[PDB]
Design a protein around this motif. Structure first.
Motif, PDB file in Angstrom:
ATOM      1  N   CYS A  70     -76.085   2.326 -94.250  1.00  0.00           N
ATOM      2  CA  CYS A  70     -75.915   3.160 -93.084  1.00  0.00           C
ATOM      3  C   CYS A  70     -75.756   2.271 -91.824  1.00  0.00           C
ATOM      4  O   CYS A  70     -76.591   1.415 -91.549  1.00  0.00           O
ATOM      5  CB  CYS A  70     -77.152   4.086 -93.010  1.00  0.00           C
ATOM      6  SG  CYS A  70     -77.366   5.115 -91.628  1.00  0.00           S
ATOM      7  N   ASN A  71     -74.680   2.450 -91.067  1.00  0.00           N
ATOM      8  CA  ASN A  71     -74.515   1.687 -89.836  1.00  0.00           C
ATOM      9  C   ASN A  71     -74.496   2.639 -88.702  1.00  0.00           C
ATOM     10  O   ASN A  71     -73.620   3.494 -88.634  1.00  0.00           O
ATOM     11  CB  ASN A  71     -73.223   0.856 -89.814  1.00  0.00           C
ATOM     12  CG  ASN A  71     -72.826   0.377 -91.175  1.00  0.00           C
ATOM     13  OD1 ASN A  71     -71.961   0.963 -91.808  1.00  0.00           O
ATOM     14  ND2 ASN A  71     -73.473  -0.681 -91.649  1.00  0.00           N
ATOM     15  N   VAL A  72     -75.456   2.466 -87.804  1.00  0.00           N
ATOM     16  CA  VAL A  72     -75.653   3.386 -86.709  1.00  0.00           C
ATOM     17  C   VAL A  72     -75.495   2.649 -85.423  1.00  0.00           C
ATOM     18  O   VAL A  72     -76.070   1.574 -85.252  1.00  0.00           O
ATOM     19  CB  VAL A  72     -77.050   4.059 -86.779  1.00  0.00           C
ATOM     20  CG1 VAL A  72     -77.228   5.044 -85.651  1.00  0.00           C
ATOM     21  CG2 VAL A  72     -77.192   4.798 -88.096  1.00  0.00           C
ATOM     22  N   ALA A  73     -74.701   3.201 -84.513  1.00  0.00           N
ATOM     23  CA  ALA A  73     -74.599   2.591 -83.192  1.00  0.00           C
ATOM     24  C   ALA A  73     -74.924   3.594 -82.087  1.00  0.00           C
ATOM     25  O   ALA A  73     -74.671   4.786 -82.219  1.00  0.00           O
ATOM     26  CB  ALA A  73     -73.223   1.991 -82.983  1.00  0.00           C
ATOM     27  N   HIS A  74     -75.513   3.102 -81.005  1.00  0.00           N
ATOM     28  CA  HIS A  74     -75.891   3.966 -79.908  1.00  0.00           C
ATOM     29  C   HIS A  74     -75.584   3.271 -78.603  1.00  0.00           C
ATOM     30  O   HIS A  74     -76.459   2.600 -78.023  1.00  0.00           O
ATOM     31  CB  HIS A  74     -77.367   4.360 -79.976  1.00  0.00           C
ATOM     32  CG  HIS A  74     -77.753   5.342 -78.920  1.00  0.00           C
ATOM     33  ND1 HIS A  74     -78.787   5.123 -78.034  1.00  0.00           N
ATOM     34  CD2 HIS A  74     -77.215   6.538 -78.587  1.00  0.00           C
ATOM     35  CE1 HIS A  74     -78.877   6.152 -77.208  1.00  0.00           C
ATOM     36  NE2 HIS A  74     -77.940   7.024 -77.522  1.00  0.00           N
ATOM     37  N   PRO A  75     -74.330   3.434 -78.133  1.00  0.00           N
ATOM     38  CA  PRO A  75     -73.774   2.704 -76.975  1.00  0.00           C
ATOM     39  C   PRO A  75     -74.625   2.855 -75.729  1.00  0.00           C
ATOM     40  O   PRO A  75     -74.856   1.873 -75.030  1.00  0.00           O
ATOM     41  CB  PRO A  75     -72.401   3.339 -76.772  1.00  0.00           C
ATOM     42  CG  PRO A  75     -72.045   3.911 -78.104  1.00  0.00           C
ATOM     43  CD  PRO A  75     -73.340   4.336 -78.748  1.00  0.00           C
ATOM     44  N   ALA A  76     -75.103   4.063 -75.466  1.00  0.00           N
ATOM     45  CA  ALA A  76     -75.875   4.275 -74.252  1.00  0.00           C
ATOM     46  C   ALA A  76     -77.078   3.315 -74.169  1.00  0.00           C
ATOM     47  O   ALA A  76     -77.362   2.805 -73.103  1.00  0.00           O
ATOM     48  CB  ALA A  76     -76.329   5.719 -74.163  1.00  0.00           C
ATOM     49  N   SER A  77     -77.774   3.058 -75.277  1.00  0.00           N
ATOM     50  CA  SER A  77     -78.891   2.112 -75.233  1.00  0.00           C
ATOM     51  C   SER A  77     -78.537   0.722 -75.770  1.00  0.00           C
ATOM     52  O   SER A  77     -79.441  -0.048 -76.116  1.00  0.00           O
ATOM     53  CB  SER A  77     -80.096   2.663 -76.018  1.00  0.00           C
ATOM     54  OG  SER A  77     -79.843   2.627 -77.401  1.00  0.00           O
TER      55      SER A  77
END
Ligand SMILES: [Cl-]
Lengths: 210, 43, 216
Positions: C197-204
Motif C-alpha cells: 500500500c502506498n499512501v501519500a498526503h500532500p497537505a502534510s
C-alpha cells in the motif's frame, strides 16, 4: 418562491429513460435540462422545453407544457451515464432535485471480507474492524455489525464506490471503530450483509482468541 | 423566435427583449436613439 | 470567447466568513446578470442569486438571504460571492455563471471549493489489512485513518497493481477523514510476492509505504 420537483431521483434502465418535472406555478415553457459529470460544469442540452442546444445529439428529447414536463434520452450510448437537472427560468432560477443514472445490469452477490484491527493500530489505543463488500449489484445493501452476538450501530462508517465501468457493479466498505481496550473486552466480531441476491445474510466473522 | 422569459425585466433598459429560441440567445431590440447590448446608451 | 475564472479553494473555521471571486474574460459584465450557484457535495444544484453589475441591484433565493452577499466590480470585470456565519452546511462548491444574453446558464467557472472546518492539517495513520488464521483469490486492504484535509492517494505496488483494486471515498469522523482501499490478487501470488500500500498526503508532506504481511 417557485418550486421544482423532478422524478425520479435515480433510475437504472440499460434502453430509453424519460424523466419528469412539475412546477409550483406554470412557467410558460421556460425549462431547461442539464447533464452534470465529475468536476465538469453542468452542460446544457435542452432549453425552452424542447429546443435542442446548438451542438447536441438528437436522442435527447425534452417535452411538455404548463406545470408538467418531460425529458427523454433515446439511448445512453455510453457517455450519457450521469446526473440530470431540470431548470425553470420563467421567474428567477430553480433547479430540480436531480436524477442520477446507473447502468442496469444483472444482479450480483457481494464478495465479503472482514479484517481485524492491525497490530500497528492497537499500539495506538484504537481498533478498527473493516469489512469490504465488493462487486455487487444492485447498489442497495444493508450491513450489520455484531459484537459477541449483539448489534452495534454506534461508530460505523460506510462508503460506496461509484458504479464500476468495466462490470457496472458497486463496492462498499464498512468500518466498526472501537477503542483498543473495548475491542479486547470482546471475542466475536461479525459483519453480515443482506442484499437482493440473498434471502439470508452473508456472514464473515472472526474471534480474537484465534 | 419567441417571447423573452419574465425573468428578464430590465435586461433591455430602453428596448424590447426578444428570445431567439433555436439560436439560444436573448436580444434587445433598441428604441430609436439607444444602442448597446442592453440598450444602455443614448444616440 | 467566454471564460469565467474563479478564485482558489477556501478552508474556513465555522462561524467565520469567506468572499469568493469570479472574473470574466471575453465579455463585459455590465451587459449581463452574474449568477452564483452552490453545489453541496453528493447533493444537487442550489441557485444562490444574481447581481446586475450595471446598477448593482440583486435578487436571492430566499434560502440564502442573510447568508450570501453578491457584489460586482465592473472595474475588474468581477463578481463576488460572500458567505457569512459559515457552518458545515456551507461546505460546498460554488459556481458562477452568466445570464441576460444567455437565456439560461451555459458558461460556468471551474468552481470554488469552500471547506468549513477548524481541523488542522493532520497526516494519516496507515494500517495494513491482511487476512488471518485461502481459495483462488485473496483480498487485502489498507486503512488510511484520521487525516485532514483531503485528498490522499492510495496506490498498490506503486501503481503496478491496478486491476482488482477498490478505493473507497473518504468519510468524516469527528472532523477528520478516513478512507480504505482493497486489492484482490491470486492466492498463488501472496504472500509469496509482496503487496504494498502506498499512501501519500500532500497537505502534510507525508508519504507512507506499508507492506501487507500475513497476520501470524
Ligand atoms: Cl462524509
Amino acid at each position: 418562491d417557485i418550486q421544482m420537483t423532478q422524478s425520479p431521483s435515480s433510475l437504472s434502465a440499460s434502453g430509453k429513460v424519460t424523466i419528469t418535472c412539475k412546477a409550483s406555478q406554470d412557467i410558460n415553457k421556460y425549462i431547461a435540462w442539464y447533464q452534470h459529470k465529475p468536476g465538469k460544469g453542468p452542460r446544457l442540452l435542452i432549453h425552452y422545453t424542447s429546443t435542442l442546444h446548438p451542438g447536441i445529439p438528437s436522442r435527447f428529447s425534452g417535452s411538455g407544457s404548463g406545470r408538467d414536463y418531460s425529458f427523454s434520452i433515446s439511448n445512453l450510448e455510453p457517455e450519457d451515464i450521469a446526473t440530470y437537472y431540470c431548470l425553470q427560468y420563467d421567474n428567477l432560477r430553480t433547479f430540480g432535485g436531480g436524477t442520477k443514472l446507473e447502468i442496469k445490469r444483472a444482479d450480483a452477490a457481494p464478495t465479503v471480507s472482514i479484517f481485524p484491527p492491525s497490530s500497528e493500530q492497537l499500539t495506538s489505543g484504537g481498533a478498527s474492524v473493516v469489512c469490504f463488500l465488493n462487486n455487487f449489484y444492485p447498489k442497495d445493501i444493508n450491513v450489520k455489525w455484531k459484537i459477541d452476538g449483539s448489534e452495534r450501530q454506534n461508530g460505523v462508517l460506510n462508503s460506496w464506490t461509484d458504479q464500476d465501468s468495466k462490470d457496472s457493479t458497486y463496492s462498499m466498505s464498512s468500518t466498526l471503530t472501537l477503542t483498543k481496550d473495548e475491542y479486547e473486552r470482546h471475542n466475536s466480531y461479525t459483519c453480515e450483509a443482506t442484499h437482493k441476491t440473498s434471502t439470508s445474510p452473508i456472514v464473515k466473522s472472526f474471534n480474537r482468541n484465534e | 423566435i419567441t417571447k423573452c422569459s419574465s425573468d428578464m425585466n430590465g435586461y433591455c433598459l430602453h428596448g424590447q427583449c426578444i428570445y431567439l429560441v433555436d439560436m439560444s440567445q436573448n436580444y434587445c431590440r433598441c428604441e430609436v436613439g439607444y444602442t448597446g447590448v442592453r440598450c444602455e446608451h443614448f444616440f | 470567447e467566454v471564460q469565467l475564472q474563479q478564485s482558489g479553494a477556501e478552508l474556513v473555521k465555522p462561524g467565520a466568513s469567506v468572499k469568493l471571486s469570479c472574473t470574466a474574460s471575453g465579455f463585459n459584465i455590465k451587459d449581463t446578470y452574474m449568477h452564483w450557484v452552490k453545489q453541496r457535495p453528493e447533493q444537487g444544484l442550489e441557485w444562490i442569486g444574481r447581481i446586475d453589475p450595471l446598477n448593482d441591484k440583486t435578487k436571492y433565493d430566499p434560502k440564502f438571504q442573510g447568508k450570501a452577499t453578491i457584489t460586482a466590480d465592473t472595474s475588474s470585470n468581477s463578481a463576488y460571492l460572500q458567505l457569512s456565519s459559515l457552518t458545515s452546511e456551507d461546505t460546498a462548491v460554488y459556481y458562477c455563471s452568466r445570464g441576460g444574453g444567455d437565456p439560461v446558464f451555459v458558461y460556468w467557472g471551474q468552481g470554488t471549493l469552500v471547506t468549513v472546518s477548524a481541523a488542522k492539517t493532520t497526516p494519516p495513520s496507515v494500517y495494513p489489512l491482511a487476512p488471518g488464521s485461502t481459495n483462488s483469490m485473496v483480498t487485502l486492504g489498507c486503512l488510511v485513518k484520521g487525516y485532514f484535509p483531503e485528498p490522499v492517494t492510495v496506490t498498490w505496488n506503486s501503481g503496478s497493481l491496478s486491476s482488482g483494486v477498490h478505493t473507497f471515498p473518504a468519510v468524516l469522523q469527528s472532523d477528520l477523514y478516513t478512507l480504505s482501499s482493497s486489492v484482490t490478487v491470486p492466492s498463488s501470488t501472496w504472500p509469496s510476492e509482496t503487496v504494498t500500500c502506498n499512501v501519500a498526503h500532500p497537505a502534510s508532506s507525508t508519504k507512507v509505504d506499508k507492506k501487507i504481511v500475513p497476520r501470524d
